[PDB]
């Protein structure tokens, strides 16, 4: 009657922010055979008809900088590389004194290094030559591999592929993932239109610096996201609405010399180059990049005064992986000079742009510990066509502020690569136990 009674309810729409163990999803066509370093087979197939329920009247506060899905993906990828490289060939005996010389041509770059090597037997040696890029070798007073004084080196199996394929992160039973579907959202704050999904969209684990490639496009206007704009020690993630076209090529028809360095082990060296000695490069249409840079600066004036000057410059210094647009393109790892893309100075109001790229075959674990990998060389003139959907910009903390702000690219932490795609997702747990009062009493 007038005195209410407690009544338990099962299956109430109630959730609280929490963290759990997320799993994956990788379509059904991703029949690629062999075995990609990640999703091939090892992942659960994706639902042919995904479901998305729009939570009407629901307003939720998201936070892309304090998300746990980023920390999981950042470490899941790292463990995925350690797993695919465990059974592959170890290149410890390759750290021998390399008697190198210039490549056969007419800024020397490539080096034709000859060395001794262990054969299938444990007695006679083997005087076989190779062709390593200058970035992978360092002299000593004859050269040596760069990692021999720091890290152990292991060659990646040639049966695996470095191509990123979409990987959907899902939550187990009892959990849910919320997707903020507003066309203008900086990743933080309350979300107007919110929806729920069991799995995220196709996220390809691309690892690039400075330039974000093959990512998701922003809606309407280009989106700007930063953890603390007033703090110049925090990166500024950018997202493009219209993607810019980029073309990369390594015009060097290389050769794969299969050397045998003992029982079962087989080292893939670089043979004689067929064709001309041409360095790798990447092209960007001058017409499109001129419109995109002018479209981003218009969004930058909404945070540093309406009438201000914005200048762009290349990296200040540091490691190689951050000062150059580094990534993967068909197997080889690139390191493109980015001094031609950030050579602008915007105030308040016809072919392509080529980039001088370099190639390394030895790459060291970004954990800073001493574990490096030798990327086997690729045969044939490689050519990759990719999108560029965002930027990773920094700001030089000038003491004379509010005058003119300079933006310099950067990177080094691949968490920002996952933050660029996980800004619209967060983990919550469903608690279906909820009590409520009503004039209902049971029996005696």
């Amino acid at each position: 009657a007038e005195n209410l009674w407690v009544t338990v309810y099962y299956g109430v729409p109630v959730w609280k922010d929490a963290e759990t163990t997320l799993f994956c999803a990788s379509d059904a066509k991703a029949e690629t055979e062999k075995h990609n370093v990640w999703a091939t087979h090892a992942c659960v197939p994706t639902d042919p008809n995904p479901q998305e329920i729009h939570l009407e009247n629901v307003t939720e506060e998201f936070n892309m900088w304090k998300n746990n899905m980023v920390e999981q993906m950042h470490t899941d990828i790292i463990s995925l590389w350690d797993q695919s490289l465990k059974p592959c060939v170890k290149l410890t005996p390759l750290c021998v004194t390399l008697q190198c010389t210039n490549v056969t041509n007419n800024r020397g770059e490539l080096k034709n290094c000859s060395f001794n090597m262990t054969t299938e037997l444990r007695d006679k040696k083997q005087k076989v030559y190779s062709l390593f890029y200058r970035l992978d070798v360092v002299q000593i007073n004859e050269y040596r591999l760069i990692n021999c004084n720091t890290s152990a080196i292991t060659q990646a199996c040639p049966k695996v592929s470095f191509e990123p394929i979409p990987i959907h992160y899902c939550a187990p039973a009892g959990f849910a993932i919320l997707k903020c579907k507003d066309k203008k959202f900086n990743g933080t704050g309350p979300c107007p239109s919110v929806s729920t999904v069991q799995c995220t969209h196709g996220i390809k684990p691309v690892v690039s610096t400075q330039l974000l490639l093959n990512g998701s496009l922003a809606e309407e206007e280009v989106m700007i996201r930063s953890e603390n704009i007033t703090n110049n020690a925090k990166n500024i993630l950018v997202q493009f609405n219209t993607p810019v076209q980029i073309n990369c090529t390594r015009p060097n028809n290389n050769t794969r010399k299969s050397i045998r360095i003992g029982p079962g082990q087989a080292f893939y060296a670089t043979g004689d180059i067929i064709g001309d000695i041409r360095q790798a490069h990447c092209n960007v249409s001058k017409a499109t990049w001129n419109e995109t840079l002018g479209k981003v600066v218009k969004q930058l004036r909404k945070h540093f005064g309406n009438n201000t000057i914005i200048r762009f410059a290349n990296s200040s210094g540091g490691d190689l992986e951050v000062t150059t647009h580094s990534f993967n393109c068909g197997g080889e790892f690139f390191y493109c000079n980015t001094s031609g893309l950030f050579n602008s100075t915007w105030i308040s109001n016809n072919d392509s742009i080529t980039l001088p790229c370099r190639i390394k075959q030895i790459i060291n674990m970004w954990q800073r510990i001493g574990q490096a990998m030798y990327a086997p060389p690729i045969q044939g003139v490689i050519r990759c066509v990719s999108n560029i959907t965002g930027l990773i910009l920094t700001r030089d903390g000038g003491s004379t502020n509010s005058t003119t702000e300079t933006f310099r690219p950067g990177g080094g932490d691949m968490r920002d690569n996952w933050r660029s795609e996980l800004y619209k997702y967060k983990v919550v747990k469903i608690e279906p136990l909820g009590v409520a009062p009503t004039r209902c009493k049971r029996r005696v």
Partner: antibody, heavy 132, light 106 residues
């Protein structure tokens, strides 16, 4: 038409200095490139070096420290010098105009090209024998 | 090096080493007792005065030697044929390649 004529001594003592002259008729010695070619008896021709105005002159890496070319614009003729001659310099020296070319294979911007030359209008040629 | 070809047929001449990169081969013809003349410059480009019967191998092939093809062989073509190799992988060749004398039979 272009008529080139060589004229020299034809006999130079060993360890001396050869002086040849290419009397040009048909065009100016400044608006064209020039090159000299020698050829021993029963052998293949050997390039010596090209000469052009504005200090554009390169020598043969095997005959670098001995040859000295020049162009006489006031007389419209090509000259040639060769100090310290031996028995191996006995050949037939020619005088021919040179038209340059640009072979591109790469991306141009990265200097992934090379300049090739070819002589089209040769001369009658002069005979030079080295003996004491 | 000598290669005899019957009159009216097609002639083949090999000169220079094997290609290591993009080339621009220059061909010449030396009449017996005369001065060498320019035949084909830039692999396969003929100047004014040379018929279309002469054709050289394109400099875009990597691994093949410079080949000079002469269609419709005549007694007048009996002379020496030298080549000048312009290779992007090799230094400038100041000595022409050892020629090949064309022998007109019949």
């Amino acid at each position: 038409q272009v008529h080139l004529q060589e004229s020299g001594p034809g006999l130079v003592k060993p360890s001396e200095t050869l002086s040849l002259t290419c009397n040009v008729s048909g065009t100016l010695v400044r608006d064209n490139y020039w090159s000299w070619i020698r050829q021993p008896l029963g052998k293949q021709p050997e390039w010596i070096g090209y000469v052009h105005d504005s200090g554009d002159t390169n020598y043969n890496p095997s005959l670098k420290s001995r040859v000295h070319l020049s162009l006489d614009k006031s007389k419209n003729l090509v000259s040639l010098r060769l100090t310290g001659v031996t028995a191996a310099d006995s050949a037939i020296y020619y005088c021919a105009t040179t038209k340059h070319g640009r072979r591109i294979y790469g991306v141009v911007a990265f200097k992934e090209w090379f300049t090739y030359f070819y002589m089209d209008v040769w001369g009658k040629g002069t005979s030079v024998t080295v003996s004491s | 090096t000598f290669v005899s070809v019957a009159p009216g047929q097609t002639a083949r001449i090999t000169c220079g080493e094997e290609s290591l990169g993009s080339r621009s081969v220059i061909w010449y013809q030396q009449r017996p007792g005369q001065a060498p003349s320019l035949i084909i410059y830039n692999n396969n480009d003929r100047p004014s005065g040379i018929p279309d019967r002469f054709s050289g191998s394109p400099g875009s092939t990597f691994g093949t030697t410079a080949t000079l093809t002469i269609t419709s062989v005549e007694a007048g073509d009996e002379a020496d044929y030298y080549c000048h190799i312009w290779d992007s992988r090799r230094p400038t060749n100041w000595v022409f390649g050892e020629g090949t004398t064309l022998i007109v039979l019949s």
